[PDB]
RNA sequence: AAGCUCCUUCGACGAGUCGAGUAGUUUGGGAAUGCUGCUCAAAAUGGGAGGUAAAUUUCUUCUAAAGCUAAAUACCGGCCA
RNA sequence: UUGACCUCGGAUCAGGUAGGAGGACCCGCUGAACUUAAGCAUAUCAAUAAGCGGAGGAAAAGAAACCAACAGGGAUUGCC
């Protein structure tokens, strides 16, 4: 029987982040309105100011 | 190649004749103790391992159990009558088996046994 | 066969029974002294397998040594440290062999089997009069026990070329310049 | 290579070091029953009863360190579960 | 959804990149480079050599992986690289040689980890029936599905497979865009550089009948045995010369 | 042993549709060259020519891929404000930069 | 010590993108900063590295936020200019 | 009391030890060369090390975590010559 | 009320034993720098010197979880 290449609720990669930003520091984007890019190539805007 | 202290680790063989005399006197000490007996034990004929040296034979450690049995010499008696025994070696070949049983038959033919006490 | 049952039970260490016994026993050892005489082996199968006999002359002493490191790593083992301390306390006995009995998070507990070389039973019995002979003084201090052999690397093969037959001896032999009479 | 006549050698007990001892297997089973399970074995049993067999294999590997050891541990624990179900 | 893919048609492909016991540090660095380039694939540590090779098909089922990249090291010197589709697909065994890793400082190129690569294949990959089966196995492994959530959005590197000898040469380049003179592409090599000699293609996951066998493969162990035999032959020639000269001297 | 029928049967069983009439290049992103690198490598020991042939093959593939992907509307160029993890670390890039610096410095120092 | 501009050192792609580099010895197109918003963002960055270290977390956050707002307004105005010149 | 022989009967072999990850140290030796510390922690047609592209992990060779043992070896110290 | 067992104690109890010296050689632990070379750093000196512990006339090692791939060898030690 064939395998379904699917992630189960125990895999380290079940819940994948949206930021598409790796293990780099967030010292970048400090002076930018956005934080990273998504899958489709659209940047992720910072929510608001506290 | 003298980056280390060879001067404190250097050795000279000025006692080569002295050690030769000492070893010869040791062989005579063994033959004074084992006077009618040979000063060594009968060792088997073994073929050298690798392809480089497999065309020649040498003396091995001891005779195998089943080649002693084929020669007709009991296990518990062979080391007593002066035959080295090697329980680790396997014959693996009728050629080695036959060579060693022939050697043991020659030893049997040339041996003299004294009757206990 | 009770010793075989205990062997399997001791292999099953994190099992419930063994874990319970090790806990309440670790508390006892923490309440007792750091080095103390153990009236009997806590692991009789391990003791008899390592050579403990129920004669007059075989003593068992239990010791706890602090675990961890000095980032420097000590070349000998906590077993070696425990054996050396037990021998120094019982300077008149010969350390036969030691074994782990309990671990704990800050200490580590070993029972050391020792033999009296001066007791008549030991002197008359073979299999132990070798340890009566004087070449076996302070085996734990010279690395002649099981942990000492393991740490010094007394195994045969290609993975122990430098360390078998003595590391310092091998280095000295390789670093001697040999000059013969007729060169 | 060279042509030498092969000889059939006797069986070696050192080769018979492979354990077929029925009494030793009996002792292992009895000690398993008496002593019980380690906490990670309890976790594996829990996952096997709930059918998370893949997760159980993964956890057994993480605890033991090798595919083969994990497989043997899971087989032993599945046998324990089957025997318990038969006994109850 | 459980695929980690957002696309109209989902190419659900996952890889288990696995290492054997006797793998050296250079082979481990290669495995790390390939695993970093593969976001749909996860690492697996040393695999017992006494285990059966189809046990790799039950390791794949555990991690829900349909593709396996198996690094098998022999004598601690030679890498054999296996590609398969579990549980019933084709498998290919290759001998990997000439390894250079991303930590080598002559490379000069770098790329986004997880970015989807443009896969370049030589023409022989659509001519010889054996090289077409290798192609689909390469596309499934070094492909990086369209909507995978662990991928990067912008594409900046090309992975090229070429057939120069009876071997597959694998290269990896960064696409550097430079403005035209009144933008065009330059390529800068970035990563692993290895050569793969095909050995067998067998109809099965790691078994079944063989569909292709090289019949022209020379083993490093064959080379070593030839050298040893040459040394033994020199010694035997010297011994034979000594015997013949002694006989002639007796005559 | 070259079982072409069996090779093709196995190929059919694992072949995902790549036909451009129904499948997009954004979906597959594989380019097959229209010429052999064999015909461009006369001698395999010539490292320069071999690497040039490999680079040219990859370059043709990259050009066609960029054309097709820009046609299909997939983002291609990496924005200057997109900072993300690399397959090679900043430390490794620093060492490559430093060896380039020392090589150029040695050459210009010999000139001086 | 010799400058990396003097030495013909290629640009290297890191977490900071190289971008579309310009050919050497050719016309590097001059982009002009004459907009009030572009002057604002350059000025905000300059004042940021001039002021430097601040003990107060909220003050640091506000400095970063004013730089971010300058970039946002610049992007909005440039997009508006793009739309204006594309439609009318 | 002992050796051998035969067999419609039996044949027990060392666990916080292997091993996995990791830090330090060491080696010609990341299949980690050995060792130690920390975390996890085994098996029974088992385990360890090698051979091998040969089509599957076949073959070869040994039994670790208990112990004893003279000789060939070293020697600026001891009793002398 | 008494008596066993277990555990832990006292005694100038009866009988023994260890400490220190020596350390040329031996078994462990610990552990440098001067020196040499190299853009730099690892490396080298050296797993040495110094320091600590433990034996003997020798010590240590030692009867394969060895070496091999042969027609195989067969505990350890030392020389070429």
| Number of DSSP strand runs of chain D | 0
Strand % of chain F is under 5%
Largest sheet of chain D: none
Number of helices of chain D: 4
Number of strands of chain F: 1
- The assembly state of the depicted protein chains is part of a larger assembly
Helix proportion of chain D: 55-70%
Helix count, DSSP H or I runs of 4 or more residues of chain F:
4
Radius of gyration of CA atoms of chain D, rounded to a whole number: 20 Å
Q: Which descriptor suits the 3D outline of chain D?
A: elongated
Spatial separation of the terminal alpha carbons of chain D: 63 Å
SS class of chain D? mainly alpha
Main sheet overview of chain F:
none
Basic shape of chain F: extended
Largest interface between protein chains, with number of residues from each side: E-F, 70 and 61 residues
Secondary-structure-derived class of chain F:
mainly alpha
Please provide the ordered H/E string of secondary-structure elements of chain F.
Answer: HHEHH
Bin the helical content of chain F: 55-70%
SSE ordering of chain D: HHHH
What percent of residues of chain D are in strands?
A: under 5%
PDB class: ribosome
Keywords: Ribosome, Ribosome biogenesis, pre-60S ribosome
Entry title: Cryo-EM structure of a Chaetomium thermophilum pre-60S ribosomal subunit - Ytm1-1
Chain A: Ribosome biogenesis protein ERB1
Structural features:
part of a larger assembly; 7 chains; C: 183 residues; alpha+beta; four-stranded antiparallel β-sheet; 5 strands; 16% strand; globular; D: 88 residues; mainly alpha; 66% helix; 0% strand; elongated; RNA-binding; 60S ribosomal subunit-like protein (chain G); rRNA processing protein (chain F); ribonucleoprotein (chain B); ribosomal protein (chain B)
Task: Describe the structure in your own words.
- It is classed as ribosome.
- The entry lists the keywords Ribosome, Ribosome biogenesis, pre-60S ribosome.
- The entry is titled "Cryo-EM structure of a Chaetomium thermophilum pre-60S ribosomal subunit - Ytm1-1".
- The structure is cut from a larger assembly and holds seven protein chains of seven kinds.
- Chain C has helices at residues 2-11, 16-31, 44-50, 78-89, 120-124, 129-132, 139-142, 146-152, 167-175; strands at residues 35-38, 58-64, 94-102, 109-115, 177-179.
- Chain C has 183 residues and is of the alpha+beta class.
- Chain C has a four-stranded antiparallel beta sheet with strand order 1-2-4-3, with helices on both faces.
- The longest helix of chain C has 16 residues, at 16-31.
- Chain E has helices spanning 25-37, 55-62, 129-141, 220-250; strands at 15-20, 41-47, 67-74, 78-85, 90-100, 118-121, 157-163, 168-178, 184-189, 193-203, 210-213.
- The longest helix of chain E has 31 residues, at 220-250.
- Chains in contact: A-D, A-E, A-F, A-G, B-C, B-D, B-E, C-D, D-E, E-F, E-G, F-G.
- At the E-F interface, helix 1, strand 6, helix 3, strand 7 and strand 8 of E face helix 1, helix 2, strand 1, helix 3 and helix 4 of F.
- Strand 1 of chain B pairs parallel with strand 5 of chain C.
- The structure holds two RNA strands.
């Amino acid at each position: 029987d064939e395998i379904d290449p699917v992630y189960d609720s125990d895999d380290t990669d079940y819940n994948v982040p949206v930021n598409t930003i790796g293990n780099i520091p967030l010292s970048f984007y400090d002076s930018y309105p956005h934080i990273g890019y998504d899958i489709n190539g659209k940047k992720i805007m910072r929510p608001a100011t506290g | 190649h003298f980056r280390k202290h060879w001067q404190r680790r250097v050795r000279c063989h000025f006692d080569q004749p002295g050690k030769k005399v000492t070893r010869r006197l040791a062989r005579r000490a063994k033959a004074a103790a084992l006077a009618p007996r040979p000063v060594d034990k009968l060792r088997p004929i073994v073929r050298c391992p690798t392809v480089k040296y497999n065309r020649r034979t040498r003396l091995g450690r001891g005779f195998t159990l089943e080649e002693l049995k084929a020669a007709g010499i009991p296990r518990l008696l062979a080391p007593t009558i002066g035959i080295a025994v090697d329980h680790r070696r396997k014959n693996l070949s009728e050629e080695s088996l036959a060579a060693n049983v022939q050697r043991l038959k020659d030893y049997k033919a040339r041996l003299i046994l004294f009757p206990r006490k | 066969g009770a010793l075989k049952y205990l062997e399997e039970l001791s292999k099953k260490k994190q099992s419930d029974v063994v874990r319970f016994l090790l806990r309440v026993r670790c508390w006892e050892y923490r309440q007792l002294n750091v080095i103390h005489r153990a009236s009997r082996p806590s692991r009789p199968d391990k003791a008899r397998r390592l050579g403990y006999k129920a004669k007059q002359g075989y003593v068992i002493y239990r010791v706890r040594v602090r675990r961890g490191g000095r980032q420097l790593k000590y070349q000998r083992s906590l077993r070696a440290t425990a054996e050396e301390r037990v021998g120094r306390r019982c300077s008149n006995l010969r350390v036969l062999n030691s074994y782990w009995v309990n671990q704990d998070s800050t200490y580590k507990y070993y029972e050391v089997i020792l033999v009296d070389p001066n007791h008549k039973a030991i002197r008359r019995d073979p299999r132990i009069n070798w340890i009566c002979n004087p070449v076996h003084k302070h085996r734990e201090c010279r690395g002649l026990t099981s942990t000492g052999k393991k740490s010094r690397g007394l195994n045969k093969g290609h993975r122990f070329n430098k360390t078998r037959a003595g590391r310092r001896k091998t280095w000295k032999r390789h670093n001697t310049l040999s000059l013969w009479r007729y060169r | 290579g060279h042509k030498t006549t092969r000889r059939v050698l006797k069986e070696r007990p050192s080769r018979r070091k492979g354990a077929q001892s029925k009494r030793t297997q009996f002792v292992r089973s009895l000690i398993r029953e008496v002593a019980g399970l380690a906490p990670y074995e309890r976790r594996v049993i829990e996952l096997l009863r709930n059918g998370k067999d893949k997760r159980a294999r993964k956890f057994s590997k993480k605890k033991l360190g090798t595919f083969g050891r994990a497989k043997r541990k899971c087989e032993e624990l599945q046998r324990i579960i089957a025997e318990s179900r038969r006994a109850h | 959804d459980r695929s980690n893919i957002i696309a109209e048609r989902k190419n659900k492909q996952r890889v288990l990149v696995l290492s054997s016991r006797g793998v050296t540090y250079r082979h481990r660095h290669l495995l790390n480079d390939l695993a970093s380039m593969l976001p749909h694939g996860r690492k697996d540590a040393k695999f017992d050599t006494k285990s059966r090779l189809y046990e790799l098909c039950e390791l794949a089922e555990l991690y829900n992986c349909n593709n396996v990249l198996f690094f098998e090291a022999r004598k601690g010197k030679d890498l054999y690289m296996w590609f398969s589709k579990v549980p019933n697909g084709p498998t290919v065994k290759f001998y990997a040689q000439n390894l250079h890793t991303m930590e080598e400082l002559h490379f000069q190129g770098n790329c986004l980890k997880g970015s989807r690569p443009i896969l370049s294949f030589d023409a022989a990959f659509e001519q010889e029936p054996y090289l077409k089966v290798i192609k689909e196995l390469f596309l499934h492994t070094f492909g990086v599905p369209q909507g995978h959530k662990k991928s990067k959005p912008f594409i900046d590197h090309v992975l090229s497979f070429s057939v120069a000898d009876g071997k597959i040469w694998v290269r990896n380049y960064e696409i550097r865009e430079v403005e035209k003179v009144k933008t065009d592409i330059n390529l800068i090599e970035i990563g692993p550089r290895f050569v793969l000699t095909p050995i067998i293609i067998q109809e099965g996951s790691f078994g079944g009948p063989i569909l292709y066998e090289n019949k022209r493969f020379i083993s490093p162990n064959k080379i070593r045995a030839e050298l040893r035999k040459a040394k033994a032959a020199r010694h035997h020639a010297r011994m034979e010369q000594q015997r013949d000269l002694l006989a002639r001297k007796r005559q | 042993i070259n079982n072409k029928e069996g090779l093709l049967t196995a190929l059919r069983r694992i072949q995902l549709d790549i036909n451009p009439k129904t499948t997009p290049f954004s979906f597959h992103q594989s380019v097959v060259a229209s010429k052999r690198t064999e015909d461009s490598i006369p001698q395999i020991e010539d490292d320069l020519q071999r690497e040039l042939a490999f680079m040219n093959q990859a370059l043709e593939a990259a050009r066609l891929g960029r054309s097709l992907l820009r046609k299909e509307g997939v983002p291609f160029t990496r924005p200057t404000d997109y900072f993300a993890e690399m397959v090679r670390t900043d430390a490794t890039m620093e060492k490559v930069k430093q060896k380039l610096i020392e090589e150029a410095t040695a050459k210009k120092a010999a000139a001086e | 010590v010799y400058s990396e501009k003097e030495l013909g050192i290629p640009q290297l792609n890191t977490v900071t993108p190289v971008g579309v580099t310009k050919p050497k010895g050719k016309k590097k197109g001059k982009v002009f900063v004459d907009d009030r918003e572009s002057m604002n963002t350059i000025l905000a960055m300059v004042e940021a590295e001039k002021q430097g270290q601040i003990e107060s977390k909220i003050m640091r956050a506000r400095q970063l936020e004013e730089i971010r707002e300058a970039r946002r307004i610049e992007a909005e105005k440039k997009e508006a200019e793009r739309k204006a010149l594309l439609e009318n």
